[PDB]
Amino acid sequence: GETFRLGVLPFGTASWEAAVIKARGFDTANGFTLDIVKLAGNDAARIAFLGGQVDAIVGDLIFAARLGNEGRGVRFSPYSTTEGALMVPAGSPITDLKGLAGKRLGVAGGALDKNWILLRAQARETAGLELENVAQIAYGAPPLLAQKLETGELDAALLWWQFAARLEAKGFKRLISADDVMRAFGAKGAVSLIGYLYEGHTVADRGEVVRGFARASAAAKDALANEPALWETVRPLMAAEDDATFATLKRDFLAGIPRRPIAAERADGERIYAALDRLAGAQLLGVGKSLPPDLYLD
Ligand X SMILES: O=C(O)c1cc(C(=O)O)c2c(n1)C(=O)C(=O)c1cc(C(=O)O)[nH]c1-2
Q: List interacting residues with ligand X (CB under 6 A).
A: 8-9, 12-14, 42, 58-60, 80, 83-84, 115, 160-162, 194
Interaction between residue 94 and Cl ion (CB under 5 A): no
Q: Residue of minimal CB distance from ligand X?
A: 12
CB of 12 to ligand X, least distance (A): 2
CB-CB contact of 206 with 198 (8 Å): no
CB of 161 to ligand X, least distance (A): 4
- Give the number of residues written for the chain: 298
Closer residue to Cl ion in complex, CB, 74/112: 74
CB of 226 to Cl ion, least distance (A): 15
Q: Which does 190 bind (CB under 5 to 8 A by kind): ligand X, Cl ion, none?
A: none
Interaction between residue 73 and Cl ion (CB under 5 A): yes
Q: Which does 14 bind (CB under 5 to 8 A by kind): Cl ion, ligand X, none?
A: ligand X
CB of 154 to ligand X, least distance (A): 17
Interaction between residue 204 and Cl ion (CB under 5 A): no
Q: Which does 258 bind (CB under 5 to 8 A by kind): ligand X, Cl ion, none?
A: none
